[PDB]
Amino acid sequence: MRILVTNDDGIYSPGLWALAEAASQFGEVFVAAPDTHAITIAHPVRAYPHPSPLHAPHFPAYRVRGTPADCVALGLHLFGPVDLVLSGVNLGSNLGHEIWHSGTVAAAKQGYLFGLSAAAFSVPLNGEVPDFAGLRPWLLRTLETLLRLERPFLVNVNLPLRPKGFLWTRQSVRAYEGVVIPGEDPMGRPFYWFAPRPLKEAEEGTDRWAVAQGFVSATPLRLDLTDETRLQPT
Amino acid sequence: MRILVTNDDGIYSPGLWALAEAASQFGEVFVAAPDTEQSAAGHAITIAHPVRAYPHPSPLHAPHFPAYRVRGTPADCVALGLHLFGPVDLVLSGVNLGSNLGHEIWHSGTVAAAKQGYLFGLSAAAFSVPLNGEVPDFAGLRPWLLRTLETLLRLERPFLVNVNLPLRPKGFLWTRQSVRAYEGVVIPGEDPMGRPFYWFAPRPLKEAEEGTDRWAVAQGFVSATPLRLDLTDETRLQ
Amino acid sequence: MRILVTNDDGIYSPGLWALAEAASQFGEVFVAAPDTEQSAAGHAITIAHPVRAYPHPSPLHAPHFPAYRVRGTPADCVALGLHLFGPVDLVLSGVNLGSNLGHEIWHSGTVAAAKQGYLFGLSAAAFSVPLNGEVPDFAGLRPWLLRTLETLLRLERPFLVNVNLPLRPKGFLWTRQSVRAYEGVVIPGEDPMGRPFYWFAPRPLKEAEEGTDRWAVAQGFVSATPLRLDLTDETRLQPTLAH
Amino acid sequence: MRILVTNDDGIYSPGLWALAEAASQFGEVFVAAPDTHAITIAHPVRAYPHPSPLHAPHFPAYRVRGTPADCVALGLHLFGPVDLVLSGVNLGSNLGHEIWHSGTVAAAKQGYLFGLSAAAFSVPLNGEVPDFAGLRPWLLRTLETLLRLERPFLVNVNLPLRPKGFLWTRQSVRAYEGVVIPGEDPMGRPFYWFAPRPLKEAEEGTDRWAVAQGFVSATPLRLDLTDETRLQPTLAH
Ligand SMILES: [Mn+2]
Ligand SMILES: [Mn+2]
Ligand SMILES: [Mn+2]
Ligand SMILES: [Mn+2]
């Protein structure tokens, strides 16, 4: 099988090459990643061949001056056909409400919109730096699980820094309490700090709960934002 | 009731004041919208980072509205608005200059503001008008905006709804989001300087299904889609 | 004469339409301004990269003006405007919502548009009004915009002038750019999450001198500063070098 | 002497470390460069210690989440006292009309406004990648020359890939002709190409002419944009 790997952090992210190397154990890997979330149609996108270092395996790759979605569209053109799109590993979590604004997820979603199977991978920072040598086994195990899934699939994966297990999860959906704290800069000019916080703790079985417990979290995602329970409201 | 009106096109957009005016027919309106000149980046609330906002006079040829121009995101305007004008019962975002249908809902800044209000435990709605070429006439659309708001306010609260109004509506329907597969058209090119680039023109594969938002607007109908916050595909969870 | 009016605040700014209406008393006016919702960008003309621009209906409560909303920089608006509405004799940029005085001129997008017109061999002027405290009253400023424009149109061409109008003008003055030395005040701080950051509060070492743009506006006067394109320090082209 | 080195290309640019190493032969060097042009006051600025590139001398360094000017204000705070601000070496020329809005120049200018001496450095691109090892002798000769100037100074420097000389220069100031090429994308949607071009050849003595001749160009800059030939008296009574 052929796999396109991309991300949101850019072509120099260690997380990108960790995912690429892990994916190469399963098929031919090609990389298209941003130079620095929808497909760009307003203007054309530039892309440049990106070289592999002395110490690394070679992967045909391009640095793309576009969005993660642009990388997917372009990658499918420059390397097509592709069977799977992998986005990440993002340096930062993509849990619960965060999934909406995620460029990592946007790339995976784009692949799915194109009819392919896709997955996004992210790791929360929490003070220390991710050890991709230690995470590698978990990337491989997660990929084994994903690749046995009925196709096509769209899955959001978050791996804690030091995982102890794997759990299929649902997105955490909590209500938030708005918190605004007025302030003044050294020149006396007013400004505001926003500090919204969730109302309750993450429910057991959710993605946020899973990673806090030390488990890799995998959430299958839907494209349909329709709330079908309210199509014929009272 | 008390209504907060915001958008993602900016404090000077005619669509913003058109929505505010229509909303004033249903309650007290307060406005908080993004300021001019600030790189459009992200739809989340700006956290633990100072955000600037200033009182702003409402348009002369419009009713008076307390208002602030916010140097932040549409979600920031909602967070700030609930604070400056609390308590708020409803958050309306728009009317966006450009449609927000099907897969576009995911990345809409207009929708993000409404979603933020819903996350804060309030009812909310986003409004968008598809303007491809021809120009939107808010005076002509006022009756339909009023009728749409009337209908939304009959819903059980809280609700989260995405509304798209064609330029000249001839009906109203509740709709589901269109979900089509796309084709990733990429056409190589070269600029006048002889440099290589690519045109991306992704195209949907089939026509919009009957009953969807994209189908409804194509019919000339106002489309109202109730939205969910949960992106989990429960059919794939054991 | 044909006048191209643009700004950097966007096609919906009341300052843009106030400037277009004032200019219409002196010639044919055409508008080309930045569209809303744009990624941060510089002030140069976008080269070897296609730019989108669309016919735009001028506002209901403003006389009619042919117009285009351009998805590019203020300089792009000028380049596109000279093409769509050519020939153009004058480029007017503003009225900017916020002042552009002294050192601020270097980085003004409003000024960048006027300068682009001048680089193209045309006459140009940038217009700005101080903000932060209360927006401007363009109806009350109209007599001053007109007065200012009549003065500029008497100048030998081509010219490049930077104009700042106080909220309530009590006169007019040709001024020079205020050029003060600064102190780079940096004050450490921490956000509600305990993370560190720095407040940068640069401050001028002295009060603005009489005769400068900053001093004039503070006195209630409309300020007009003629600008040079050449940044060469002409007194150091043959510098004395130490032993 | 103490030197703050910054740029606008970011902390990863080889041009920045080339300037830092050359400058270290004249004094102690500290680096503050953008993470990705005036000082930011509307909000704060975040900055983080950053390692200098492996296989290169070590320099105290911070990557700043702000503008080139922010780096200067932050650098003066983190590494004060500072005697000289050097910005570059920018990958891309900063000649003639380009000076006005160059981020590289903006940093040097900020340093000058703060009362220090400052200089911006740039190298032209297209085709060949700058060879900083080969450029080092010319960077050193240029810095040695600037350090002989009466202070404070503000100079804009452009170095050809393979210099064969050095010249003080005037800023090129040519008029441009607008060129707009209408077009349509593959979907038949209209767009516009902009290709403005200078009207004549650069004059002798200017920065653009000097670099075209293979010489390092050094232009002293003036901060006062006032055109005194057009200043006027008031028409009062
Ligand atoms: Mn990321
Ligand atoms: Mn919008
Ligand atoms: Mn402005
Ligand atoms: Mn640069």
B76 is in an annotated binding site: no
Both structure tokens of C19: 């400037």
Closest CA to C133 of C185, C83, C97: C97
Cα torsion angle, C215, C219, C220, C221, sign:
negative
Residues belonging to chain B with any Cβ–Cβ distance to chain D shorter than 8 Å? 49-52, 71, 185, 187, 189, 191-192, 199, 201
Q: Determine whether the interchain pair A115/B181 forms a contact, defined as Cβ–Cβ distance below 8 Å.
A: yes
**Bridge partner residues of C222 (DSSP):** C172
What is the residue type of B234? E
Closest CA to B74 of B61, B100, B62: B100
Closest CA to D12 of B39, C43, A71, A13: A13
Cα torsion angle, B133, A100, B209, D189, sign:
positive
Q: What are phi and psi of A142, to 5 degrees?
A: -65, -45
Instruction: Report the Cα B74 to chain-centroid distance in Å.
Output: 10
Give the neighbours of chain B: at least 3 Cβ pairs within 8 Å.
Answer: A, C, D
The string of DSSP codes covering C13-48 is: -HHHHHHHHHHTTTSEEEEEEEPSS-----SS---S
What is residue B41's three-state secondary structure? coil
Collect all residues with Cβ–Cβ distance below 8 Å to C123 and sequence separation of at least 6: C89, C90, C91, C117, C152, C155, C157, C158, C159, C160
Residues in C closer than 8 angstroms to A186, CB to CB, are 185, 187, 199, 201
Secondary structure, 3-state, chain D: CEEEEECCCCCCCHHHHHHHHHHCCCCEEEEEEECCCCCCCCCCECEEECCCCCCCCCCCEEEECCCHHHHHHHHHHHHCCCCEEEEEEEECCCCHHHCCCCHHHHHHHHHHHCCCEEEEEEECCCCCCCCHHHHHHHHHHHHHHHCCCCCCCEEEEECCCCCCCEEECECCCCCEECCEEEEECCCCCEEEEECCEECCCCCCCEHHHHHHCCCEEEEEECCCCECHHHCCCCCCC
Q: Determine whether the interchain pair B227/A232 forms a contact, defined as Cβ–Cβ distance below 8 Å.
A: no
**Alpha-carbon distance C83 to B161, whole Å?**
44
Both structure tokens of C31: 């508008």
Cα torsion angle, C106, D69, C194, A187, sign:
negative
Closest CA to B36 of C39, C133, C20, C10: C10
Tokens 């040097």 belong to which residue? D108
**Alpha-carbon distance C166 to C95, whole Å?**
12
**Alpha-carbon distance A135 to A211, whole Å?**
14
Residues in C closer than 8 angstroms to B191, CB to CB, are 48-50
Cα torsion angle, D149, D152, D154, D160, sign:
positive
Residues in D closer than 8 angstroms to B71, CB to CB, are 42
| Contact between D51 and D62 (Cβ < 8 Å) | no
Exposed e or buried b for every residue in D221-230, given b needs 16+ CB within 10 A? Answer: bbeebbbeeb
Distance A113 CA to ligand 1 centre (A): 21
Q: How many CB atoms lie within 10 A of CB A189?
A: 14
Secondary structure, 3-state, C65-132: CCEEEEECCHHHHHHHHHHHCCCCCEEEEEEEECCCCHHHHHHCHHHHHHHHHHHCCCEEEEEEECCC
| Contact between C125 and C145 (Cβ < 8 Å) | no
What is the residue type of B15? G
Residues in C closer than 8 angstroms to A187, CB to CB, are 201
The string of DSSP codes covering B137-156 is: -HHHHHHHHHHHHHHHTTSP
Both structure tokens of D16: 């920045």
The string of DSSP codes covering chain A is: -EEEEE-SS-TT-HHHHHHHHHHTTTSEEEEEEE---PPP-SSPBPEEE-PPPTTS----EEEESS-HHHHHHHHHHHH---SEEEEEEEES---GGGGGS-HHHHHHHHHHHTT-EEEEEEE--TTS---HHHHHHHHHHHHHHHTTSPSS-EEEEE--SS--EEEE-B-----EE--EEEEE-TTS-EEEEE--EESSPPPTTBHHHHHHTTEEEEEEB-S--B-GGGSS--
**Alpha-carbon distance A155 to A216, whole Å?**
12
| Contact between A83 and A52 (Cβ < 8 Å) | no
**Bridge partner residues of A86 (DSSP):** A5, A119
| Domains, in order of start, for chain D | 1-237 (3.40.1210.10)
Q: Determine whether the interchain pair A36/D41 forms a contact, defined as Cβ–Cβ distance below 8 Å.
A: no
**Alpha-carbon distance C20 to A87, whole Å?**
49
**Alpha-carbon distance C109 to D164, whole Å?**
38
Cα torsion angle, D105, D109, D110, D116, sign:
positive
State how beta strands D47-49 and D28-34 pair: unpaired
Cα torsion angle, A127, A133, A136, A138, sign:
negative
Distance C139 CA to ligand 2 centre (A): 29
**Alpha-carbon distance A127 to C3, whole Å?**
58
Outline where DSSP puts E strands in chain B: 2-6, 28-34, 52-55, 67-71, 90-97, 123-129, 160-164, 172-174, 182-183, 186-190, 196-200, 203-204, 222-226
Q: Compute the residue count for chain B.
A: 238
Q: What are phi and psi of D135, to 5 degrees?
A: -80, -20
- Resolution of the experimental model, in Å, one decimal: 2.0
- Find the CB nearest C231 among D73, D77, D171: D171
Distance B37 CA to ligand 3 centre (A): 7
Residues belonging to chain C with any Cβ–Cβ distance to chain B shorter than 8 Å? 8-10, 12-14, 36-40, 47-50, 54, 56-57, 59-61, 97, 109, 132, 135, 191-193, 195
**Alpha-carbon distance C131 to B40, whole Å?**
22
**Bridge partner residues of D64 (DSSP):** D34, D47
Residues in C closer than 8 angstroms to B13, CB to CB, are 12, 36
**Alpha-carbon distance D2 to D18, whole Å?**
17
Q: How many CB atoms lie within 10 A of CB D233?
A: 6
Up-side HSE of residue B221: CA atoms within 13 Å toward CB? 16
Q: How many CB atoms lie within 10 A of CB C5?
A: 29
Chain A: nearest CA to D16, how far in angstroms?
A: 18
Q: Determine whether the interchain pair C36/B54 forms a contact, defined as Cβ–Cβ distance below 8 Å.
A: no
- Residue B1 CA: distances (Å) to CA of B92, B135, B150: 13, 32, 13
Size of interface B-D (CB pairs under 8 A): 21
User: How deeply is B11 buried, as exposed, middle or buried, from its count of CB atoms within 10 A (0-12, 13-18, 19+)?
Assistant: buried
CA angle D125, D127, D131 (to 5 degrees): 65
Residues in C closer than 8 angstroms to B139, CB to CB, are 60
Exposed e or buried b for every residue in B21-56, given b needs 16+ CB within 10 A? Answer: bbbbebeebbbbbbbbbbebebbbbbbebbbbbbeb
Q: Determine whether the interchain pair D39/C120 forms a contact, defined as Cβ–Cβ distance below 8 Å.
A: no
The 8-class DSSP code of residue B8 comes to S
**Alpha-carbon distance B236 to A218, whole Å?**
11
User: How deeply is D147 buried, as exposed, middle or buried, from its count of CB atoms within 10 A (0-12, 13-18, 19+)?
Assistant: middle
Tokens 């491809």 belong to which residue? B132
| End-to-end Cα spacing for chain B | 43
B96 is in an annotated binding site: yes
**Alpha-carbon distance C41 to C58, whole Å?**
25
**Helix (H) / strand (E) containing B77:** helix B74-84
State how beta strands C67-71 and C28-34 pair: parallel
Tokens 């290709």 belong to which residue? D195
Chain D: nearest CA to A213, how far in angstroms?
A: 31
Ligand nearest to the CA of A16: 1
D46, D187, D191, D192: best to mutate for the B interface, most B CBs within 10 A: D187
Nearest residue on chain B to A191, alpha-carbon basis? B52
Q: Determine whether the interchain pair D191/A36 forms a contact, defined as Cβ–Cβ distance below 8 Å.
A: no
What is the maximum alpha-carbon separation in chain A?
65
What is the residue type of D100? W
**Alpha-carbon distance C117 to D62, whole Å?**
39
Nearest residue on chain D to B53, alpha-carbon basis? D42
Q: How many CB atoms lie within 10 A of CB B115?
A: 27
| Contact between B78 and B90 (Cβ < 8 Å) | no
**Alpha-carbon distance C45 to C93, whole Å?**
15
The 8-class DSSP code of residue B215 comes to H
Q: Determine whether the interchain pair B49/C135 forms a contact, defined as Cβ–Cβ distance below 8 Å.
A: no
State how beta strands A180-184 and A190-194 pair: antiparallel
| Contact between D74 and D64 (Cβ < 8 Å) | yes
Peptide bond just before C158 cis, omega within 30 deg: yes
**Bridge partner residues of C39 (DSSP):** none
Closest CA to B1 of B35, B36, B28: B28
**Alpha-carbon distance D211 to D123, whole Å?**
9
What is the residue type of B235? T
CA gyration radius, chain B? 19
From the annotation, which residues of A make up the binding site? 8-9, 90
